[PDB]
Amino acid sequence: PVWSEPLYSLRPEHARERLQDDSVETVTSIEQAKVEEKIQEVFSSYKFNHLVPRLVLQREKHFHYLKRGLRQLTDAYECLDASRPWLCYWILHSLELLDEPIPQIVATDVCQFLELCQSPDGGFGGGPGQYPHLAPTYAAVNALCIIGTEEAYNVINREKLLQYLYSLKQPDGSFLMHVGGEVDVRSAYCAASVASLTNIITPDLFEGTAEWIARCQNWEGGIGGVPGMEAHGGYTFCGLAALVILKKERSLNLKSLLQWVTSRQMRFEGGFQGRCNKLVDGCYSFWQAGLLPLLHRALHAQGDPALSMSHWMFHQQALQEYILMCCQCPAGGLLDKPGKSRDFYHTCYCLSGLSIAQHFGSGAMLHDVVMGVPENVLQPTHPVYNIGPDKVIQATTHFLQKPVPGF
Amino acid sequence: FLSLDSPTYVLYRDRAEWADIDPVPQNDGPSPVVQIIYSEKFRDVYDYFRAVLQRDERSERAFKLTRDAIELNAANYTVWHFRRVLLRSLQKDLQEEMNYIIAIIEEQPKNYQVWHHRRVLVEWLKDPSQELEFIADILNQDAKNYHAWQHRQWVIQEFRLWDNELQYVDQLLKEDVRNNSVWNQRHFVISNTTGYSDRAVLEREVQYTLEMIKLVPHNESAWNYLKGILQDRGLSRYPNLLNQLLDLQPSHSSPYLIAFLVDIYEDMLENQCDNKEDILNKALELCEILAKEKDTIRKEYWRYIGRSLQSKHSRESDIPASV
């Protein structure tokens, strides 16, 4: 119909999705209403300006933002001076999603830099001369794999990497994030991710790990940082993804998990929140929505017959609408929500989440959903590692030619 | 001695007491990537931090230098590790360090390193006497600070300080009955003290929750809690619940009440109840109402549920193909 609005967020009924505070105001409802009011302005900005809505992913702008940041950053990134491999990864993956080539001049300079970040004892630090830590180790390995050259692969000292992982392993199955550091589910995922890609997983490396992770699932259905803590999309992604790598997804109550994550998508905004009763945020477009492709593969592995063969169990269209209309900075780069400033972290995950929502794939079945102009389509991303599905295969294949350290 | 923001602050390369030390520039290589254009103050402090670290100089001056390095980037875990090495080698007073961490967390409460540092201090001193109060102050500024709640659970658990936490929980739920962190803390306290098997306790909790649900029918936290404490034993195990929820259908409806009803029907059809068909249709009716009207954002989930229920509870579900 002519009166029919193709955009879910602009349809008249959408107005019914606004928050109902039952005339009972608390800090939570107040903050939630503030955001919805701002998001509503964005949605109805076309109507008020008397223009036809058009959703365009500002590729050119994001490329420039990323291209430059990969080489140089302002002092605004001083707070990430101990997360430089993360910067390499967030940027390289964003370029990958946008399907932009990585010049060998860059690739080789990245390799050399990460080489300098690598510790003599194994693992990568947040910068040259910094002690090794599982977060930058995870980022570094992912970055080198995105590059996927023999040179990038050879940067990783597999013997020491394994030694390092062992030095962090705890009796209860968990891992420290670094020597004398904290413990939470992120480490299990970081360890599983780099160990599986570089083929260094030994018979006992992850003993008790699946059980420990399973203890982090709480009454909410989601997973918390450590046993007993509130469920959160960041830790839930880490927990499930790690269990998938270890092939122990079944250790969890997948049903309560599925119900929890699907409930994390905001009815009005369209994006996801990190935990119940908090605010929507673009990076969860990946941490939360990225869980659905994982649950689909887990349930289908269990022969679940009711599994759709075209879509993920979340409103794909609404998520894309949220990201495209509310999370792009006009000067390039993406963000948390309107009013927040861009950064490479949100640029990486908003894009990763957009990709997930655009591409459905359960084996031979393949169905895409690209909101707005067709140029908006990005390259696919692997739901476990969050790097190109091809980079994963290529990387694992390459390292499977090597022998698991110590044989 | 000299604060990082002090008007008379001086770069380390201009300090007499540091003349013997040659700073160590960051080794970024010939052609750097993600190179940060640090400010003078930043590069100066870190060039000197790199020097003391490299020499493993365990001195009072190195100790003070870590404070500035941390202030410039509290996320630099390498600096925190060296600082803890200095705390022990120099035999620094740990209560003084506690006063220090208290202040740093107050200004940068969403950082991982500061909370881990505080935990290490408490562990060393074996003294949790200041924790609940300190955390309470942080939670007073951000009632949902994840690290704060995690530290609180750790402290309570490790030193068995369960006695007043439920009271603290009630207080915060009163301030904001929508605070999911507090509903989580409630489940934390109870399951570790009495447990939810004690019928008197479970009874109390459900009444409390339903009572909060009446006051704020659209608050998703109360619903998730109600479901969380009854789902393990099985929702169908409690016949009065289903009815009592339908009694709110008119004056307290929400996509949450509709959703719960489906969960009850679901478990009922699981534990083969009476009228295994009147319940099923009642469920598919709701699943469709949600996927098409009351909760369309989750249409792909509700259609899957409606499908799963039909795939195993229809009258044809247990009937042979040839029949």
Partner: peptide, 5 residues
């Protein structure tokens, strides 16, 4: 904004 490590 958000923090990972």
């Amino acid at each position: 904004g958000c923090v990972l490590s």
